[PDB]
Amino acid sequence: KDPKRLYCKNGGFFLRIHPDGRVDGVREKSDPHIKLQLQAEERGVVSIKGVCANRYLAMKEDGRLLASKCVTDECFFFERLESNNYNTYRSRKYTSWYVALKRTGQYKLGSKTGPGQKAILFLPMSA
Amino acid sequence: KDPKRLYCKNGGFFLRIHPDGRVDGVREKSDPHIKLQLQAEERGVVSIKGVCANRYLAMKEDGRLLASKCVTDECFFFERLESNNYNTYRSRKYTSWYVALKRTGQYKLGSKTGPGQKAILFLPMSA
Ligand SMILES: O=P(O)(O)O[C@@H]1[C@H](O)[C@H](O)[C@@H](OP(=O)(O)O)[C@H](OP(=O)(O)O)[C@H]1O
Ligand SMILES: O=P(O)(O)O[C@@H]1[C@H](O)[C@H](O)[C@@H](OP(=O)(O)O)[C@H](OP(=O)(O)O)[C@H]1O
């Protein structure tokens, strides 16, 4: 309900959604574009909206990330709860692929993600 | 200190700064792009920063308004209280021109502004 920041355990980057739809991670907590709004769709399914960008994170058919102005089926992810309050987000459309960030803060392509990676674990935090 | 919205008396529009630098007015409080940050430069001088856009309101030489990624001398305005709790913001660079919004929510060119207009009167409010 409240806004969130998703803190990636793989180097501690907050998942960031830019006004133009680019997706990446940054460490600066005061960054306005890491303020996200998670919305329940079905049980355990969420969309992830950049509040400032007013766009929905989308997993593309080639494993790229791009935030969409309009919701599509590419914008829904399974939220699975994991160890020490960390969540994973798996594309509903491309069911082997996760939202993920590299240790550099560049996001990790879905094709290269998988269970157990540090890259896919995000901790929701307050805003 | 805290973020603010500038509520314009000329039709009740909140001043909005878009990521691409466009400036306009909208009535929806929940619009993420009406969260502004006012920063004092000199006494009674301010810059006006769109928080989500991360850009500074600038008055241009032809009276256009456009939000700057970088601060320049066009980004400073004299903040003066007039009327009944409503402020005016007068360009330091183009000293006869004010920040202003039309009754439609399109912003009014600085060349067409002047003291006593409703278009130039803004009430700072909380965010
Ligand atoms: O390797 P590059 O030159 O950076 O370009 C890659 C991709 O083709 C996109 O152009 C870019 O945006 P999206 O993939 O998000 O659409 C993204 O940038 P980034 O991952 O470095 O942020 C990269 O995945
Ligand atoms: O903005 P949206 O709603 O996400 O829509 C576009 C579309 O979904 C495609 O997947 C892709 O272009 P093509 O597949 O036609 O090449 C592009 O992503 P990309 O540029 O980040 O790869 C997106 O802009």
Curated annotation (Swiss-Prot), chains A, B:
Residues 102-118 are annotated as: Heparin-binding. Coiled coil: none annotated. Phosphorylation at Tyr-56 regulates FGF2 unconventional secretion. Several N-termini starting at positions 94, 125, 126, 132, 143 and 162 have been identified by direct sequencing. Heparin binds at residue 10. A motif (Cell attachment site) lies at residues 20-22, 62-64. It is found in: Secreted; Nucleus. Monomer. Homodimer. Interacts with FGFR1, FGFR2, FGFR3 and FGFR4. Affinity between fibroblast growth factors (FGFs) and their receptors is increased by heparan sulfate glycosaminoglycans that function as coreceptors. Interacts with CSPG4, FGFBP1 and TEC. Found in a complex with FGFBP1, FGF1 and FGF2. Interacts with FGFBP3. Interacts with integrin ITGAV:ITGB3; the interaction is required for FGF2 signaling. Interacts with SNORC (via the extracellular domain). Interacts with glypican GPC3. This protein binds heparin more strongly than does aFGF. This is Fibroblast growth factor 2. It comes from Homo sapiens. The gene is FGF2. The chain holds residues 160 to 286 of 288 of the full protein.
